[PDB]
Curated annotation (Swiss-Prot):
Organism per entry: Gallus gallus (Chicken)
TM spans (from-to): none
Subunit structure: Monomer.
Protein's recorded name: Lysozyme C
Major site of localization recorded for this protein: secreted
Length: 128
């Protein structure tokens, strides 16, 4: 599923991300835009052999099991395919664990380079 901007903002809010660990909703929408273009089915391979999955591009090195990342962990205790569902619950729950791990949203390189320090509220402006 390819979300619309305001549609995703609403789903993220219902699932508890607005000001989760101090990050307003616009931060999460901006992050999803540049990680996945709002597409739940986005995948991208990393040079180390891991893969990033879903609307927030969660990495199989640490967070989910895809059966093809040797020496990896599965800290969210899910198959990586669950992060590709049209239902974003698994992605959101795993993202909350990531953002609580000490580096905040700097765990997402696209957030650090394209969202951090910008007017991220613009990503939710106009939304009901
Ligand atoms: Cl933080």
């Amino acid at each position: 599923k390819v979300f619309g901007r305001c549609e995703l903002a609403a789903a993220m809010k219902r699932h508890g991300l607005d000001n989760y660990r101090g990050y307003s909703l616009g931060n999460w929408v901006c992050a999803a835009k540049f990680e996945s273009n709002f597409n739940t089915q986005a995948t991208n391979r990393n040079t180390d052999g891991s893969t990033d999955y879903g609307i927030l591009q969660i990495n199989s090195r640490w967070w989910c099991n895809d059966g093809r990342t040797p020496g990896s962990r599965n800290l969210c205790n899910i198959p990586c395919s669950a992060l590709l569902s049209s239902d974003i619950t698994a992605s959101v729950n795993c993202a909350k664990k990531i953002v609580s791990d000490g580096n905040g949203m700097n765990a997402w390189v696209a957030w650090r380079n394209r969202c951090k320090g910008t007017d991220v509220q613009a990503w939710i402006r106009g939304c009901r």
